[PDB]
Symmetry: D2
Subunit: 94 residues, 4 copies
């Protein structure tokens, strides 16, 4: 199955994002082929640098909701309390 995974940072938790970004990126690495599209949501302005990140979006291939939840739970970002909003949706290409 495919899932949308949409997560928005707590307001001014930017530092938590920057401090944990490398670990989060390393966490995604072994899952690459299962991750079809992924990248950070961005804030005010037109900047696309690290300081403009406000959250994470991914489309994830997984065999169950249990798998997705467990993937979310063990994200370094999740363990560090970075997120204020998390939305997960079963999904398909159109």
């Amino acid at each position: 199955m495919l899932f949308l995974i949409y997560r928005k940072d707590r307001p001014g938790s930017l530092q938590v994002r920057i401090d944990n970004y490398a670990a989060h990126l390393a966490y995604l690495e072994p899952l690459k082929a299962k991750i079809q599209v992924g990248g950070p949501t961005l804030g005010a302005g037109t900047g696309t640098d690290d300081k403009d990140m406000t959250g994470s979006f991914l489309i994830m291939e997984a065999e169950s909701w249990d798998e997705v939840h467990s993937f979310v739970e063990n994200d370094p970002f999740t363990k560090a309390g970075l997120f204020a909003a998390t939305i997960v949706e079963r999904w398909k290409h159109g």
Copy 2:
């Protein structure tokens, strides 16, 4: 610029989606170039057919927030009153 566009149907409004899906697809058609990813969110169970659709997701290229809002507003789905939730985010590939 890249934008996440997330919309969820009002609960109970599947038929509104069904009756208007063709018009919705026709509206998206000229924009194929600008749309990097597209598809519906899906509901309960494991089915991936039309009657499982519960919403719409796009990643789209646009020059402004104005352009994105205009695109959202002119969707046949919008005027049809289909959506109870709309989320737009500026976004980039990781």
Copy 3:
């Protein structure tokens, strides 16, 4: 019926909120009797002043989804394009 009405400002649009706050409050005034709970969402830190506003939340009584949706469309804040996210939910007290 009762509805949750949840709206988040577009990042960087604080100025649009300031410019339209008066008209927005004017718009809510006649409908004061239908609004059970109302207030702005807040951003980073612990401040609770105008400059801390990041969005709008309401619990409102309406006779139908059409009434709620129209109430949302006619908001000065809507017509000014302040919001990046809007979520409406049918709801009841516990």
Copy 4:
């Protein structure tokens, strides 16, 4: 601090809600005095009974984001894997 806590059930998990509702409510009971508003989101139609529930909304007083997140995590509904979406927002009465 006041927080909006918005949580939507995974599609088709109504029976998980029904089976655990009592344990969820007993969880909320000791914290009654910190909760200003609470009740479930409702789905399609106009029914307002148990089978209509689709999520949980709360406005709650807490001393920190970490307290809110710990509150949420220890909810019997959380541990049952009921929720697909969770949104938390710092907030104030207008």
